[model samples]
Target: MDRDYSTPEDEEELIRKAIELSLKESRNSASSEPIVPVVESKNEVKRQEIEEEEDPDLKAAIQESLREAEEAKLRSERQKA
Candidate 1:
């Protein structure tokens, strides 16, 4: 039983050491990249500047009637000033 165990044992040791070093290098190179939070806001309005080019006299007549009708009612009732 004189088959010296040094040669086979040294090869196994070298393989184990190579695997250990590879694992350590990979772990170091795989760095962390953290995440972040963000937010945004926006606003707008839907409007147009349309000119009143259609009915000036019609608008004025309605305004005049409301005031005259209220005056006639007061006169008929004879309310005190």
Candidate 2:
């Protein structure tokens, strides 16, 4: 059986349902770790060393990973649409 709703309230209800499903999927697939953290001074030094390395290859890899994550976000939004 198929059910169709047309009023503004009905459309809003469908939109809310879609949003809820998207949120559920996002939460389920999300990383367990905090992506960004407020670290203590000691940890900050370690983080700085990790981020500030002079290796060109490592820098490129980090940039690629950041780009991929951004692309994935856009893909997810399109999937919702």
Candidate 3:
């Protein structure tokens, strides 16, 4: 039989190929990506921060809390002997 002298056709080669294929398949499924089995859509959320804004009332309330904390600290240290 005329055989090409490129690769060896043996049982070891087949075992190596089978092991590599299984390794690749296992790695693909183990990735922690949320994959859906559906067609690609353009309406998907791109996980972007489209808008970031400050609320004025919330800022004022935070400042008031900080002021009260500072005042309480001054009350505790109000005496010097």
Candidate 4:
């Protein structure tokens, strides 16, 4: 077994080297995390996102409908005058 003693500055330099390498090869920089867990986490996030989303698109549609109704009401009032 190989023995190693890393000093604070040494460890820091190693971390800096990794960050530089990651940024340099940004396209190919990949996480070393277990693939199965990563997939599961992503699926879980998708599920939560679906469940928790307030559906901004639908909200905007509803707001536009309400505006159309108000405009129609104003038009009818103008016709009555």
Candidate 5:
């Protein structure tokens, strides 16, 4: 059986909201640590498994999301500064 996945926009908004809440909670708890680095390190290792991606579209999509996440991290760092 096939399943229909929700659009990226839908998931993106949900993930963004979750990240925002996590950051807020972390800040309120008085921690300078970020929530992304631990998970991002794992993701970076997994990304290395794709030595040669045959699907250009999928690769592009993944790259775009990574870019967004990195940008968000930078923004958070700037806020700390």
Candidate 6:
């Protein structure tokens, strides 16, 4: 409908005002704390976390099962020989 432009225009303007208010309030609250220090610590912690995810137990379990499968295949080949 060509007559529906006013509806969206009003809604869009209202949303813009609402978002601006949220931004101002959030800026005031966050301005008290320096984000850089927190970000630095979080980055260091995340890097440390990367070294902790190899999951040795599950890795060993999967390796053991796959080793068994390979041994079974070798045994079958030996029997055929």
lDDT of each: 0.80, 0.74, 0.79, 0.74, 0.75, 0.74
Candidates in order, TM-scores: namely 0.29, 0.29, 0.30, 0.32, 0.29, 0.29
User: For model 1, how does the per-residue alpha-carbon lDDT over 1-81 read when each residue is reduced to its tens digit?
Assistant: 337754565778799999998887744546788886665666687787796777889889999999999999978987669
Q: What value does the lDDT take at residue 81 in candidate 4?
A: 50
Best by TM-score: 4
How does residue 37 of candidate 4 score in lDDT? 39
Could you tell me which residue pairs clash in candidate 5? none
Model 4 segments more than 4 A misplaced: 1-52, 78-81
Candidate 5 lDDT over 10-75, as tens digits, reads 778899999998887743555587656444443334345657659798989999999999999988
Question: What lDDT does candidate 3 reach at residue 41?
Answer: 61
9: Cα error in model 4, Å = 81
Which RMSD values do the candidates have, in order?
Answer: 9.2, 39.5, 21.3, 25.1, 44.4, 25.1
Residue 65, model 5, lDDT: 99
Quote the RMSD, in angstroms, for model 4: 25.1
Off by over 4 Å in 3: 1-52, 78-81
Off by over 4 Å in 5: 1-53, 78-81
Off by over 4 Å in 1: 1-53, 78-81
lDDT of 2 by residue, 1-81 (tens): 134544465777799999998887744545576578666556434434456458799889999999999999987776535
